[PDB]
Amino acid sequence: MKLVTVIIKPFKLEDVREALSSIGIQGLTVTEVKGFGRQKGHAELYRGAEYSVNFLPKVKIDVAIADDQLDEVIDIVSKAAYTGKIGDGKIFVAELQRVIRIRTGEADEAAL
Amino acid sequence: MKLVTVIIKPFKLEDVREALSSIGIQGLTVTEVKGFGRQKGHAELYRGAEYSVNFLPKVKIDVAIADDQLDEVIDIVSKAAYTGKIGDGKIFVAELQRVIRIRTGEADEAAL
Amino acid sequence: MKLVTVIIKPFKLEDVREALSSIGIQGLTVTEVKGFGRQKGHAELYRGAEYSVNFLPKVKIDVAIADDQLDEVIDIVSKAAYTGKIGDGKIFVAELQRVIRIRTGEADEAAL
Amino acid sequence: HHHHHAVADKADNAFMMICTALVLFMTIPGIALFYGGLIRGKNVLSMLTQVTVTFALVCILWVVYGYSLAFGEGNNFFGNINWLMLKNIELTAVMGSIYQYIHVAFQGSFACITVGLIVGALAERIRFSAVLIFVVVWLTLSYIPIAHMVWGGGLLASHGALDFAGGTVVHINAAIAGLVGAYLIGKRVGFGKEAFKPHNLPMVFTGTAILYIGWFGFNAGSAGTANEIAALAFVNTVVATAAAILGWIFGEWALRGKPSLLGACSGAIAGLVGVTPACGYIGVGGALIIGVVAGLAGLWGVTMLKRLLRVDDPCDVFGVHGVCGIVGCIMTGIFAASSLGGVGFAEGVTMGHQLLVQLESIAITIVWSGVVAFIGYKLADLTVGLRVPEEQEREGLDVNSHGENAYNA
Amino acid sequence: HHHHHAVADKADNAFMMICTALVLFMTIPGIALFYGGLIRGKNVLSMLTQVTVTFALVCILWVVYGYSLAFGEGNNFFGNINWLMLKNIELTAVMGSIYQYIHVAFQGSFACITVGLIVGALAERIRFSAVLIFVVVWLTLSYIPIAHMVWGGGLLASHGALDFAGGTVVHINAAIAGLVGAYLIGKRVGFGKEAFKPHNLPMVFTGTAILYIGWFGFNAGSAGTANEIAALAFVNTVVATAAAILGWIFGEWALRGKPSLLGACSGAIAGLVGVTPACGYIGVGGALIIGVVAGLAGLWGVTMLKRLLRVDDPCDVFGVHGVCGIVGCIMTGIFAASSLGGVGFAEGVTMGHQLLVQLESIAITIVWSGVVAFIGYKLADLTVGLRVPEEQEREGLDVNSHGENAYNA
Amino acid sequence: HHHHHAVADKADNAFMMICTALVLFMTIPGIALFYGGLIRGKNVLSMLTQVTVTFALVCILWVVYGYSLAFGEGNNFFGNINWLMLKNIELTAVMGSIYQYIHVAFQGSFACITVGLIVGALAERIRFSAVLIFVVVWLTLSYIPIAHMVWGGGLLASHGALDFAGGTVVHINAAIAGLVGAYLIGKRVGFGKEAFKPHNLPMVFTGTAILYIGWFGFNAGSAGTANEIAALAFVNTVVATAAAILGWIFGEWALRGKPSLLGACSGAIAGLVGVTPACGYIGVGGALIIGVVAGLAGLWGVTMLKRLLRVDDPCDVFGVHGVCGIVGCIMTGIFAASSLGGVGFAEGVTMGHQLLVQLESIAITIVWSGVVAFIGYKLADLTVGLRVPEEQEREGLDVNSHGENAYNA
Numbered sequence A, B, C: 001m002k003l004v005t006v007i008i009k010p011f012k013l014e015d016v017r018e019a020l021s022s023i024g025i026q027g028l029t030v031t032e033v034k035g036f037g038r039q040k041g042h043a044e045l046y047r048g049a050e051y052s053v054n055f056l057p058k059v060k061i062d063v064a065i066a067d068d069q070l071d072e073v074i075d076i077v078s079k080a081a082y083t084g085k086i087g088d089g090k091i092f093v094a095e096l097q098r099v100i101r102i103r104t105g106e107a108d109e110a111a112l
Numbered sequence D, E, F: 001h002h003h004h005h006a007v008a009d010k011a012d013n014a015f016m017m018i019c020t021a022l023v024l025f026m027t028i029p030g031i032a033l034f035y036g037g038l039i040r041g042k043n044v045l046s047m048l049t050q051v052t053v054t055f056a057l058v059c060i061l062w063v064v065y066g067y068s069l070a071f072g073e074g075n076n077f078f079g080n081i082n083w084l085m086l087k088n089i090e091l092t093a094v095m096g097s098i099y100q101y102i103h104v105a106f107q108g109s110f111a112c113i114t115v116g117l118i119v120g121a122l123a124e125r126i127r128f129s130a131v132l133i134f135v136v137v138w139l140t141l142s143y144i145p146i147a148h149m150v151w152g153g154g155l156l157a158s159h160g161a162l163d164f165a166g167g168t169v170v171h172i173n174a175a176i177a178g179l180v181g182a183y184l185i186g187k188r189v190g191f192g193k194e195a196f197k198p199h200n201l202p203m204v205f206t207g208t209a210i211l212y213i214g215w216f217g218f219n220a221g222s223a224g225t226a227n228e229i230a231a232l233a234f235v236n237t238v239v240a241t242a243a244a245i246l247g248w249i250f251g252e253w254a255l256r257g258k259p260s261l262l263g264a265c266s267g268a269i270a271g272l273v274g275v276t277p278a279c280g281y282i283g284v285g286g287a288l289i290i291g292v293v294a295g296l297a298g299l300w301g302v303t304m305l306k307r308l309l310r311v312d313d314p315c316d317v318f319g320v321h322g323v324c325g326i327v328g329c330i331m332t333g334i335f336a337a338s339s340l341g342g343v344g345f346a347e348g349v350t351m352g353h354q355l356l357v358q359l360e361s362i363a364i365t366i367v368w369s370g371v372v373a374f375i376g377y378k379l380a381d382l383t384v385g386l387r388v389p390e391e392q393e394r395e396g397l398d399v400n401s402h403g404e405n406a407y408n409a
Ligand SMILES: Nc1ncnc2c1ncn2[C@@H]1O[C@H](COP(=O)(O)OP(=O)(O)O)[C@@H](O)[C@H]1O
Pocket: A026, A027, A028, A029, A030, A062, A063, A064, A065, A101, A102, A103, A112, B007, B034, B035, B036, B037, B038, B039, B040, B056, B058, B085, B086, B087, B088, B089, B090
């Protein structure tokens, strides 16, 4: 079992979610996050205070899938979330041990 | 060391919190997330606009534990977080290579 | 590739951010989370209601790094985030199978 | 002599229109913000919609037949049908020292805030269409006749009751209707096991402040003119509120350990409710005592009295408006005395007798409003159902009742 | 008797000063919170600043030469420069039964809200500098001549137009101006592909509530004194707003599925706008019919109309102020009739002649504002460019145009 | 003819009661929201509780002895003890052309806002109980005597000082009390190395707007009647505020590269303060110039001056109310002249002589308030201690000092 995390630009959420729905993946979790990197927030001014560097709103997507699915999921999200500009995002992959559905008690594959 | 992640319905936080206390686990981290899958959001209207596809508010619990505690946790969390209804959430298990307490420098069990 | 998730006190973000720059680590993801453990958070009063169990605000940092930088990261983060009082937080470590930069398609080390 | 008529004073016309705007300000957005903030984020819109729409329903019913049946001449309980749609009321008709159209609007705003208050007790689990149906019944068969009994020349006015701005007509009237409601629908799911925190305390404070400012129209406006009585009701409004905020804070700080914002806000409302029936009748010192007592009475109401009855009234309508209205209505019958710096009881009357009339008025309102509310709630339950299903209660009324989310990206 | 002067009525002075405050309350913060809540978080500050700065700009232009050109003696389209920086107007000068200085401020607050209305149709893609340029041109060439033609003895006033508080002058004027802006600056990025929800509905409600309370000073104050006409306009304001709220709500519940909170709020404005030209001329029954029709019309304006016009008018300025403005002006030439409970038409005028006069005023207003708005936007786009780059639009107007983030830790 | 007495003018009674209400609106909730939005979210409730509780406190002290000591007759420093709890004041007693009970309310509201303004320099690190103690000492010893010297026929009044609505009494007085407080308690932890953004800028705009609207009752109300002076003060408030918004906005645009909402808000207050002591004495042209200058002076006030003073005055109370207060008090002595559009000086008073008096009034206000403020903060530190420990400062004053959390589920 694999767990794929994707950090992207907020407006490109609906496209990725629909790219995931194309391959039968409707189950997913989303978190509002703040990011910093090569691309950064515009200067901020508050009376006397001036903060030249700021954080930028981003979106973190979490999806549990199967090993065989890993190949397609990476390729489908990579294109769907692409815009060309700096700050497009990154794809993280990690090994998931056991997945359990609370409602029924189902395991790994049947839990999704 | 293991990392246990549970995604549940916001109204069932208190129960799981207490269940974890029942087995001696007081420390944890909570995040407000948006979930989509089998159970989905209710359509919403704003003036002329109609929005059918919607996300559901969920609560993500991340609890780091010892490896001899794995089976004890999944069980007490399942029962505590259970309602029977669709969209009850799911449990995710992942291996932690290292856990360190900033305050002391201690690792593994000593870090929790 | 390794993922280092650091849960700290909100005001210590600035100190951790700079310390991370000190060793050439500019890219990171931040999330607003809620914590509980040895540090607990004062009791709250609402008219007739008395809530004894409350969470504390925390900042969660997610940072994908290279294998060797691991020990150096732990040392510099522990130091910059340190206060000596309870609730300073913890550093967690997990293995990442792959990291891909969406904008270019670069993998692992190159993607960061 | 038969064609003689009072001339309207432009100062009073001006004062009373502005005061009407302030009473409307108390409901829109006053009470909507107050209540909205006290409940959960998932149910705020439901409170805002209920207040807005009931406000609308009441405004229309008031001009259609409400004013006529409340301020028209007849028996001790109801008025006349003669002033329907305001027909037969010349635009230049003068009520006291102001045009009647202004009077219609002033009394109309009172009806609105009274219905607004009720909604707070039905919070988080009531059906939207149930509250609209209940309002039609309760306004028609309770607000109107009680208003006619106290301010319309009916039974309680004939008995010499003392209620300047609505201790009975508004506060106790609404408090009862809310208490009956809550008891009928029952506890919110998770009560006593889950946290039911106010979602936005800055919102509660904003609502409190607007209720406070608008209350000057409410209390001073009750004079019907910008005279010395309006001046007396004004200062007394400032005194009671301040005294109640302090009475409440010092109670909480000493009994619970910390002075909270919800306590300072609740105190102001308790003071305001406390002085509502007494404002234009008492002196400055009396307002200070009523203020301190109401502030402490309310604290007790939202804490102990709330436990003694085991009823889930989310916004504590009965603990504040019920308890403080009752305390203020009784105290008015004492502090009106001339030796207490009051304006003096009517000719012949003594504290003793007056004390009973204040008590008589309270009991009649409680039973009147209670029975009618029980009637209204039954009618609605029967026709559209009172309570929403448990799942829709946990996910919230904003989305499945009004199909909207409160806070988005 | 040339040295005989009119003496100001202190009561009218007080009433009009307060009413001016009420209309100012409509812009600062009324319309700003109303529109600010309707758009997304990354853009709320852009809205609040546009309204604030355009407010200031209007206040300045108005006192320098604005008032003099609209209300000073001239021809049928412009006025005079005899009152530059208010010179020539003595402080003790009387206009009606008040000091002219009060008239200045009262009429000034009208221009302010008018400009604040337009901004909502330009939200999220317009450059800041552009809005300020458009205002200088539009206020000067569209507002002042239109205000003079209607309320300054000009063309429309001499033809017998009925516009009590700004059906043409304020609403249609603004709606058209906004429609032109929406068309010329194009659709927002992601339109029809992404969800555009109001970030803060409680904020919208607060703005709606403030606009309502402020409107009483807008409509009633148009009487110019605290008389029976002000009493009529006040009452008609309560009535139409409630009717419209009920109109919309039930229209939405039946055709869309549920009664939304935004629906109710939008219904309030619709009723308010619709009654603006009619409030002082119609009977309480007329206000009811107008309110209902206006509410339903507004529902059409933001639903079918908007989708057919194919415009991105984010705050539906036209769907509400244009559709209900036109509807209101027409309904005024009808319900003013005596046989319909109205105040009656001027000596020797029948329903036909009036109705035709109402239509003439409407057409003229649309063409005048539309042509001048087209010119206004052209200069802004010529000097500074009307639309911000795509990249700036996705990131937010706040951070890019104003260097600030609305919600911090 | 000893039994002769003045008669109240109902217009003035209404005008003044509405003004009192507008002035209270500035504190509840105006200044609370304004300051609330400027500080972090973990402390917003402490700001609201401080304003609400200090307000209550000021009201009680005002009616018990405050009004009497400031307004009763005595010497050039303070009044008398004859009006304790308003005893000896007949309900029908007339002050000017209004019932004295109204005068008591109006002046008491000025005492409230002044104390509210002070609280924004102590935010995020002061102990709640310490604030209470300070208020009792400062109001009693500083506000009362200053109010008596300027508006109570005292010392400064007797020398012909020109302060129409409180440049010295309200603004300069509070600014100094605040500056002193911020110096004594010290800089907030992290000051200079940590980011301190306002948590809610819409809340800041909201408060600003309320402050502006409420300020009409503040400035125009200071006329004591709805006469021509009231109207002059009204127009000047509209002009100066608009001018200051543009002054700050453009100054910031030129120097920093962007026009911010905070800039606009700050500008609005800066003009209001600047025009507070001049509104009733200057011409429309004076109001414009005073406005522009006030806006740029407040800009320099919160930038360069704040950096020079090395003070952590979080809400820039001094940078705005102090600077603009001084600027306004000085500029009043200029623009009051007849040859500059003003109402003119008193019989046989040159401009050179008036300026000396203004500087004298500024010197005495800064000096008295400062020393009194010192005694107060010291009395508070001897008994309860002024600053909360560092760790409470980190978690937030909300849960530590008030046991509540502002935003929840
Ligand atoms: N493939 C997935 N990856 C990550 N999270 C998921 C996935 N599927 C579901 N979830 C999470 O679990 C929640 C409940 O899932 P759902 O299918 O609606 O209920 P159930 O778990 O009872 O079948 C979702 O809201 C989402 O947060």
